[PDB]
Amino acid sequence: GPEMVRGQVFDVGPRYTNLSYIGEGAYGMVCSAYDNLNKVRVAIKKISPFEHQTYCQRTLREIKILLRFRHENIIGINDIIRAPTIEQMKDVYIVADLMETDLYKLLKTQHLSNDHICYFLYQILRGLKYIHSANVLHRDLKPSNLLLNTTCDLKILDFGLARVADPDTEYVATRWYRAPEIMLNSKGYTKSIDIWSVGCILAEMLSNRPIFPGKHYLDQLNHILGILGSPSQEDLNCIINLKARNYLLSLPHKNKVPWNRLFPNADSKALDLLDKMLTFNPHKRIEVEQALAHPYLEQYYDPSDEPIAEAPFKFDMELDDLPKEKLKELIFEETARFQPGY
Numbered sequence: 141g142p143e144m145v146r147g148q149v150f151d152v153g154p155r156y157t158n159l160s161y162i163g164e165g166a167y168g169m170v171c172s173a174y175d176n177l178n179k180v181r182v183a184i185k186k187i188s189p190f191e192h193q194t195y196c197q198r199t200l201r202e203i204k205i206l207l208r209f210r211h212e213n214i215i216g217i218n219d220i221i222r223a224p225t226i227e228q229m230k231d232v233y234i235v236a237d238l239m240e241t242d243l244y245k246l247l248k249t250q251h252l253s254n255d256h257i258c259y260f261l262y263q264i265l266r267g268l269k270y271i272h273s274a275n276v277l278h279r280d281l282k283p284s285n286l287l288l289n290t291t292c293d294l295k296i297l298d299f300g301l302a303r304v305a306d307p308d309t310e311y312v313a314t315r316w317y318r319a320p321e322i323m324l325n326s327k328g329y330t331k332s333i334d335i336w337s338v339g340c341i342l343a344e345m346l347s348n349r350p351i352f353p354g355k356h357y358l359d360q361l362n363h364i365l366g367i368l369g370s371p372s373q374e375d376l377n378c379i380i381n382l383k384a385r386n387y388l389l390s391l392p393h394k395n396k397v398p399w400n401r402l403f404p405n406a407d408s409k410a411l412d413l414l415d416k417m418l419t420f421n422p423h424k425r426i427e428v429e430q431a432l433a434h435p436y437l438e439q440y441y442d443p444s445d446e447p448i449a450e451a452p453f454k455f456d457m458e459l460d461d462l463p464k465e466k467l468k469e470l471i472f473e474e475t476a477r478f479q480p481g482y
């Protein structure tokens with residue numbers, strides 16, 4: 141029979157053995173396992189989406205994007221296991237490189253020196269540069285979506301909320317990393333929403349504490365304005381939405397808090413870059429290639445070793461809202477090339 145982990149079956153043998161609980165991912169339980177073919181311990185995520193439309197849809201979408209993307213700072217799929225007939229397939233197991241932890245857990249437990257911060261930040265933007273080059277917005281960068289290994293290699297996870305970057309909410313664990321414009325007008329304008337999310341992660345690395353921990357929807361904007369200050373007139377004039385602009389004008393005045401008051405031990409170049417990432421106005425916010433070229437990342441900056449996508453990625457939006465059972469069939473087809481062959 142199959143091995144079991146906290147009452148959950150992991151029918152991944154004979155190739156993968158000696159399973160052990162790591163944690164809960166956003167889509168299912170994650171265990172570590174020994175790969176008997178490559179002689180190495182790997183991470184295996186178990187996914188059970190076929191009891192709902194939204195899970196099947198997001199599963200199919202994630203498998204397609206991670207299979208097309210190939211970059212060292214973005215999580216890759218090494219293998220996929222499922223039953224040989226669609227009628228048996230009640231679960232899907234995705235296999236990936238074993239890392240040590242996520243940035244969420246690391247920051248709850250330990251200090252990061254400037255070199256670790258600097259190197260982690262470089263890798264987030266390196267990976268993000270590839271994603272944005274494919275015309276994709278992540279829209280949910282946060283510490284829990286960043287995996288680290290023991291040699292400080294960093295990988296980005298979770299394109300569940302990813303979209304094309306052209307002009308066009310639900311439940312999420314945290315709004316602490318959402319850019320202000322997302323709640324002030326068009327639903328996540330541009331690539332600057334991700335740069336905002338990365339700035340928030342930088343701040344959190346400097347202090348081990350999230351910078352904008354809103355306790356509810358409107359509170360999130362109060363946290364942001366309480367540090368950045370009230371928007372200037374120029375910045376106010378970039379808020380296109382009538383109600384948003386009015387709402388901003390109705391709020392109490394707040395003065396800017398200097399960065400070196402919040403982060404008194406931080407490298408002044410780090411705070412300079414942070415200032416440019418956490419700019420209220422998304423049109424003035426620093427872009428990924430410019431951020432990589434900031435003096436703070438001079439040690440690692442190397443545009444010959446910062447690859448871009450071969451082409452733009454396209455999401456087939458019509459597959460969304462297809463019937464539960466049809467999505468099950470497409471996931472069977474997409475996972476077929478990992479089934480023992482030839």
Ligand SMILES: Cc1cc(-c2nn(C(C)C)c3ncnc(N)c23)cc2ccc(OCc3ccccc3)nc12
Pocket residue numbers: 162163164165167170183184185187198199202203206215234235236237238239240241242287297298
């Ligand atoms: C997002 C994600 C995280 C982890 C993971 N999560 N964790 C911890 C944070 C629980 C890890 N620790 C060490 N190594 C790891 N690989 C992990 C394993 C994963 C293993 C497979 C995987 O497949 C991506 C995927 C494919 C299809 C649908 C949804 C997700 N995604 C994983």
